[PDB]
């Protein structure tokens, strides 16, 4: 059925993230970072943004108005110009994991801090508060 604490939509999205974690070989630690980030930024839903016209032309579970942030990871269109990718769970995850891997020391870095660095966020506390669930969800997905 569904993953721990996720409805069927969130579950679908998380499975796509977890699947890309396997493909990219980031292990549970990587998966924890991806899911924890997804929970904070969007609660694992695909957001569009009025501020980015092209994003309304892709399937989305809701609309938000944070900067030019789009998708599950709230990747800024400024920096991530391919909106198709930003609005696709698997491809958007690949974009997260790609940046995460370029961070020297990520494999043994605390998850909260790792998400902060990847997202350019100002506080790790938000992501850290979500790791317990991210683990449960990653485990249930096969990582
Ligand atoms: Zn870990
Ligand atoms: Zn700003």
Residue numbers in the entry: 85 to 227
Sentences from the paper on this structure:
Attempts were made to crystallize the full-length enzymes from T. terrestris and P. virgatum. The full-length protein consists of an N-terminal CWBD followed by a catalytic domain. However, the CWBD was lost during crystallization, so the structure starts from Gly85 and only contains the catalytic domain. There are two zinc ions from the crystallization medium, one coordinated by His132 (corresponding to the cadmium-coordinating His63 in KsGH184), Glu135 and two waters, and the other coordinated by His170 from three symmetry-related molecules and possibly water, or some unidentified compound from crystallization/protein production. The proposed flexibility of the linker explains the difficulty in obtaining crystals of the full-length protein and its apparent cleavage during crystallization experiments.
Muramidases are N-acetylmuramide glycanhydrolases which cleave the β-1,4-glycosidic bond between N-acetylmuramic acid (NAM) and N-acetylglucosamine (NAG) in the carbohydrate backbone of the bacterial cell-wall peptidoglycan. Here, the identification, characterization and X-ray structure of a novel fungal GH24 muramidase from Trichophaea saccata is first described, in which an SH3-like cell-wall-binding domain (CWBD) was identified by structure comparison in addition to its catalytic domain. A ‘domain-walking’ approach, searching for other sequences with a domain of unknown function appended to the CWBD, was then used to identify a group of fungal muramidases that also contain homologous SH3-like cell-wall-binding modules, the catalytic domains of which define a new GH family.
